[PDB]
Amino acid sequence: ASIFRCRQCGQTISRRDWLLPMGGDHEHVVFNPAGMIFRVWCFSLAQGLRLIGAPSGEFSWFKGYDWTIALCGQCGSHLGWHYEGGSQPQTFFGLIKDRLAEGPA
Numbered sequence: 001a002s003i004f005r006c007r008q009c010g011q012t013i014s015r016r017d018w019l020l021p022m023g024g025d026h027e028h029v030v031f032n033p034a035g036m037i038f039r040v041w042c043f044s045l046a047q048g049l050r051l052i053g054a055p056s057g058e059f060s061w062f063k064g065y066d067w068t069i070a071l072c073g074q075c076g077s078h079l080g081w082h083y084e085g086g087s088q089p090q091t092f093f094g095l096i097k098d099r100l101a102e103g104p105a
């Protein structure tokens with residue numbers, strides 16, 4: 001249980017070593033304006049994603065950061081968001097925990 005893959009197709013996405021405790025915790029539970037709840041895990045790094053559109057500040061869950069939707073680069077599953085435009089760190093990924101599968105490297 002050391003890397004995270006896309007639950008839908010198996011694309012390699014991130015690693016447990018890359019987990020990032022933003023504000024004290026790598027886990028943040030959030031809702032969007034449609035009332036969907038997401039359990040977001042913050043990672044310093046990820047791969048195999050495809051970032052869509054240009055960054056937006058609207059309704060950002062992390063103060064000072066602008067977000068872009070992150071899809072799985074292989075299957076197009078919505079895996080979370082890439083955050084940028086902030087400070088310490090300038091950028092990071094917030095990935096939806098239950099859309100990943102964890103397993104050996």
Ligand SMILES: [Zn+2]
Binds near residue numbers: 007008076077
């Ligand atoms: Zn996928």
